[PDB]
Amino acid sequence: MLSAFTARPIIELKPRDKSRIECILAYGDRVLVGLNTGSLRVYRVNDPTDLLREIERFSPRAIEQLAIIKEANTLVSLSNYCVSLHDLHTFEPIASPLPRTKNASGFAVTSNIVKDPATGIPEIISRLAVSVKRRLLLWSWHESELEEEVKEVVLTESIRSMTWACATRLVCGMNSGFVVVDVETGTVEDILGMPKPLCTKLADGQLLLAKDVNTLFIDDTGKALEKRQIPWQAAPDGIGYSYPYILALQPPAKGCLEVRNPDTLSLLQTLSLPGAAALHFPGKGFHVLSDRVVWKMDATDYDSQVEELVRGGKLDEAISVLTMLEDALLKNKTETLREVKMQKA
């Protein structure tokens, strides 16, 4: 229906290579690949990739998850079922393991600009939240300085997914359902309207929740929205958002990626990515990783997308896409939109 993104492979392991990819991290020019052997490769993205540095025995076991906080110049790694903080550039350990992170399931990182209530000065605040059984551990950086106190919230069930709704609220997903946690006040709220609980952040403080084939739309406060359920045939393995589209990753056996409209819920695009098992997000594209290939998703310019929709006769979809987009991303959103509306009538 639409060529929203173009898929090109930037990293390829060979079929009989003993190493497999477990997670990646892309920041600027660089892509950091964590392997099942504990090694950590660093790639430079050219304009496909050049292997700059391999750190074997970075962690004595597989690297499950990677993140960074740029203010503190810190690399967060989930390995040996614990969490470790390394220097982003020398990769020497700052704190490995991080205290109380033993048997951690995962973590979620955010960093936002917040104003001091007393002085009203913009300050960069960083949040790292780790899931350890039914416990939620919260570290924070104030001006890249890690605070000496760790906040802990105890839940009623084990945490299976963690997605930051905003700078102060975190959506946590368990088996029974989803909850909203206020990291500042430690207050938990129930969300009202083996399958993994999926959650991704949309635009304008909106979030999409998915369990099996059921879906729900909420806001940054965690209140339900009057929206239809997304009509996809099978439950997605993962979900994500790349402005302005919703992305759904089907199980690795199918090896497909769905690009859907958050407004009309129609299937804009389907991409065949064999073995694709995870999505990686930060108007620039995202990444999709298999156990051997890392593809970079390049978004087509939105003017050509709307022209393609108009040429196909999908007028209502072009109107919805145009309404969603910011005006600076189009040559002339106003006149293009009025034109498409006059083509409809």
Residue numbers in the entry: 1 to 47, 96 to 241, 271 to 359, 369 to 431
What did the article's authors report about this structure?
Lysosomal fusion is fundamental to cell survival and requires HOPS, a conserved heterohexameric tethering complex. The heterohexameric HOPS complex mediates fusion of late endosomes, autophagosomes, and AP-3 vesicles with mammalian lysosomes or vacuoles in yeast, and is probably the best-studied tethering complex. Five out of six HOPS subunits (Vps11, Vps16, Vps18, Vps39, and Vps41) are predicted to share a similar architecture, comprising an N-terminal β-propeller and a C-terminal α-solenoid domain.
The intrinsic low affinity between HOPS and Ypt7 prevented reconstitution of the complex for structural studies, therefore, we instead relied on AlphaFold predictions. Cristal structure of C. thermophilum Vps39 (1–500) construct (cyan) is shown and superimposed on the model of Saccharomyces cerevisiae Vps39 (dark green) generated by AlphaFold. Furthermore, the binding site on Vps39 is placed approximately 5–6 nm above the membrane if Ypt7-anchored HOPS is in an upright position on supported lipid bilayers.
